[PDB]
Amino acid sequence: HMKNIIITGGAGFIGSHVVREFVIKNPEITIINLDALTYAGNLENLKDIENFPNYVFEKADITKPEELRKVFEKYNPDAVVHLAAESHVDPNAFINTNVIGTANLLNLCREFWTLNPEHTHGRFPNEPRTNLFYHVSTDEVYGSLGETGFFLETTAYDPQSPYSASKAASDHLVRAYGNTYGMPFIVSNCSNNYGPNHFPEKLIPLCISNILNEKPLPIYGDGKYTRDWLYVIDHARAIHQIFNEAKTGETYNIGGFNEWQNIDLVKELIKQLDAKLGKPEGHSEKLITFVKDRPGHDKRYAIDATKLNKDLGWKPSVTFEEGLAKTIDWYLDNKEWLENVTSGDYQKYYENQ
Amino acid sequence: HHMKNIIITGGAGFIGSHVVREFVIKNPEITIINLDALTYAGNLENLKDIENFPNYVFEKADITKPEELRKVFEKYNPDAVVHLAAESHVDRSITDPNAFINTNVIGTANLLNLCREFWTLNPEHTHGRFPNEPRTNLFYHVSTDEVYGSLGETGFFLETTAYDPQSPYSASKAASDHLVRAYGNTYGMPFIVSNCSNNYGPNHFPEKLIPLCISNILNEKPLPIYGDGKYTRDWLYVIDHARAIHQIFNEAKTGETYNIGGFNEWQNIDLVKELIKQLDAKLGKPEGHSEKLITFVKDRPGHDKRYAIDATKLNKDLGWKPSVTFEEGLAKTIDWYLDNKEWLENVTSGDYQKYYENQYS
Ligand SMILES: NC(=O)c1ccc[n+]([C@@H]2O[C@H](COP(=O)([O-])OP(=O)(O)OC[C@H]3O[C@@H](n4cnc5c(N)ncnc54)[C@H](O)[C@@H]3O)[C@@H](O)[C@H]2O)c1
Ligand SMILES: NC(=O)c1ccc[n+]([C@@H]2O[C@H](COP(=O)([O-])OP(=O)(O)OC[C@H]3O[C@@H](n4cnc5c(N)ncnc54)[C@H](O)[C@@H]3O)[C@@H](O)[C@H]2O)c1
Ligand SMILES: [Cl-]
Ligand SMILES: [Cl-]
Ligand SMILES: [Mg+2]
C-alpha cells in the first residue's frame, strides 16, 4: 500500500483539484503538493485542505534536480501524479519545465523505486501496483481535426504549437522510461478544462467578466473554433480513478463528451448570466463583436474518451451547460479570490502564510 | 533565391560527414558550414578529403550553448540548416544524465530559435500555408525511424505511422521532430523532416555493429548471435542517405516528411552470414571458413524486434532509390574498411580527438 504520493503542480488550476481529490479520498496517505509557485500557482486554491493531517506543501522546482532530490529523500514517494507544466512560450523555459522537468522526476523515480528488469518491453505484471508515474497531458499532442473524426488514443501525435510539442515530448519520455526500465506509468490526455479556480484571464472567466462589466465579447471570424470542454472537477475524479483502477502502461483520453464552437459558448454564458441576473432575454447579446478571422481559427479539437468509460465506467458528472452553471456560481461566490489574482496579492500567500 | 550559406550540424559525425561532402561537391557556389561540438562521436578525420575546399568551413560550436550558435549565425547569416547533431549514449555519465535531452531537444530548439530570429518568415505561411515557390530558407531535420516504435512480423513504418518511441533516445529524437513541425506551423518556418533506417558504410565507428562484425571476422573472434538472430533492420547505405537528404532538400515540397530506407530488411543472422561470405571470398578463404565463429547466446528482451521502412512516398514523389543493394553496400563497406585501417586505428587509440588541435592550430 502507498504511503506518500507527490502531486506536482498542485498549486495550479487542475492540480489543486487533484490534490483535493487525493487528500479527501485517501486519509491514510500523505499527499505532497510539489510546486515552484510560478505566476500560475495559487496557494489560495487549497485554503480548505491546507490544514488536513495528510496534506503537505513543498516549494520546489522540477528543473532543479537538487531541490527534487531533497523532496524525494524527505518523503520516499511511492507515486507521482505529474501536472507541473509551463504554457507561456529564456525562450526555452517551457521546454526546461515540460521536458527536462519530466525527465528529472523520471530519473529520481528510476533511482528511488526498485524497478524489475523483468517488466521491461511492455511486460508489466497483472499483479497489483507498488509504484506509479501518472503523467497528465493534453489532447493537443494529437494536432487538430477536420470536420469529421475525434482524437483517439491511437491517433498519431501531431502537435502544432511549441507548447504541445513540449507536452508530446514529455509523454514520449514517460512511455520510453516505462518500456526501457520497467517503470510503471499511466498517461492521460485531456481536453480544455474549466471551472472553479480558473484564472480570470482564461477564456471562460474572461467572458463572464466581460458580460458582467458590459465589455465587448470579441468573436474571431465566425466563431467556429471548436473545443471539447471538461469540467475540472470531473478531470480530477478521472485521474484519481485511473490512478487506482487502470492497467499499468495504459493511455486514456479524458473529455467532457461534447464539442462547442466559441460563438455558442459565448451565447450560452450570455444566456445563463442574463437569466441569473434577471436581465431581459438577449440583454448581453449586444456585446458580441465579430472581428477578423485568426489563421487556423477554423480548427476543431474533439477528444474521444469512450475507451475510458468502456474500461472503467468513468463519465462526466455535468454537461457543459451544467458545468458552466456551477462555474458561474463559483465565480459570483469568490469575488475575493478573483480580486486576489488580478491584484497579484495571491502570490504573497506563501510569504505571508 | 539562391542560398549562399548552409549549416550542417553534426557534420563531423558519421552521417553528417557524408552529408557535408554531398553538399560541398554538389554546390560549389554555396558555403557549407560544418557546425560540430566535436564530442567523442565526432571525427574531423572524416573530412580530410574536403577540408581545404573553397566552399567548406568548419565551426566548432555546441548547439546547447546559444552564445556559440549566435556567433555562427552572425558570421554566415545562414540560409538553411541541415540538422544532424545528436546524442545517443543515454546513461553515458551520471555527471550529465540528461545530456541526450539537452543536445537532442534543447539543442534543436536553440537552432530553431536562431532561424526564427535571423530568417524573414511570412505570417501568411503559418498553419501549413507554404507557397509553391522556390524556398529562400529551409530547416532540414534529420531523424530516426525509431520514433515509430517497432514492428511485428508484418507491416512497415510509414510517414503516417503513429509515433511510439520506445527508448529515451528515440523519445528525445521524436521530441525534436515535434519542435521542428510546431515551429513550422506556428511561425511559418520552412522545414522538412526525414526519418531513416540504420545507416552503415564508410567512417562508421569501429564498435558499431557492422564494423565490429568485420573486425571479429578478420580477427577470428566470436560473432555473438542473440536467440535465433531474427532481429531485423532495414539497412541504408550512408552515402545513399546523404544523396536522399540532398535531393529532398532541393526537390521536396515545404513541410513534407519522408522516410528513407534501403528498400530491404535483414535478420541479424543473415547479415552476419553475408559478411562471412564476402569477407571469406575477399581474403581467399574456403567457403564457410568463418562460419565457425558464429556463437548462439541467450535471447534477450527486445532482440526479436523488427524495424523496416516503406519508402513508397519518397520513391513516388522524387523517384529516389538506393544506389546499392545491402550486399553491394556491404562490399563497398568492406573495401573501405580494408583501405582505412589507419582511420580505424586513430579512432580506437583516441588520436582522432586531437585532429582539431593538431591541424587547426
Ligand atoms: N485546459 C487545461 O488547463 C489543460 C488541458 C489539457 C491538459 N492540461 C495539463 O494539465 C496540467 C495542469 O494544467 P493547469 O492548467 O492546471 O496548469 P497551471 O498553469 O494552472 O498550473 C501549473 C502549476 O505548475 C507549477 N509549476 C510551473 N513550473 C514549475 C516548475 N518548474 N516546477 C514546479 N512546479 C512548476 C505552477 O506553479 C502551477 O502551480 C498541465 O500538465 C497541462 O499540460 C491542462
Ligand atoms: N544509424 C544511424 O546512425 C542513424 C539512424 C537513424 C537516424 N540517425 C540520425 O542521424 C543523425 C546523425 O547520426 P550519426 O550516427 O551520424 O551521429 P554521430 O554520433 O556519428 O555524429 C553526431 C555528431 O554530432 C556532434 N554533436 C553531438 N552533440 C553536439 C552538440 N551538443 N553540439 C554540436 N555538435 C554536437 C558530434 O560531435 C558528432 O560529430 C542523428 O540525428 C541521428 O538521430 C542516425
Ligand atoms: Cl472566436
Ligand atoms: Cl543477433
Ligand atoms: Mg470508443
UniProtKB/TrEMBL annotation, chain B:
Chain positions recorded as NAD(+) binding sites: 14-15, 36, 39, 62-63, 84, 103, 169, 173
Domain named NAD(P)-binding: which ranges? 7-333
Keywords of the record: Lyase, Metal-binding, NAD, Nucleotide-binding
Keyword Calcium appears in the UniProt entry: no
**Pfam families reported for this sequence:** GDP_Man_Dehyd
Cofactor(s) essential for the protein: NAD(+)
Enzyme kind, highest EC tier: lyase
| Coiled-coil features, chain-numbered ranges | none
Catalyzed chemical reaction(s)? dTDP-alpha-D-glucose = dTDP-4-dehydro-6-deoxy-alpha-D-glucose + H2O
GO terms in the biological process aspect are: nucleotide-sugar metabolic process
Which CDD domains does this one have?
dTDP_GD_SDR_e
Q: Where does Mg(2+) bind?
A: 310, 312
Q: What EC number(s) has UniProt assigned to this enzyme? A: 4.2.1.46
Origin superkingdom: Bacteria
Which is one GO molecular function term here?
nucleotide binding
Q: Does Lipid metabolism count among this protein's keywords?
A: no
Q: Which family does it belong to?
A: Belongs to the NAD(P)-dependent epimerase/dehydratase family. dTDP-glucose dehydratase subfamily.
Entry-linked NCBIfam families = dTDP_gluc_dehyt
What is the designated name of this protein? Answer: dTDP-glucose 4,6-dehydratase
Look up and give the organism this protein is from: Elizabethkingia anophelis NUHP1
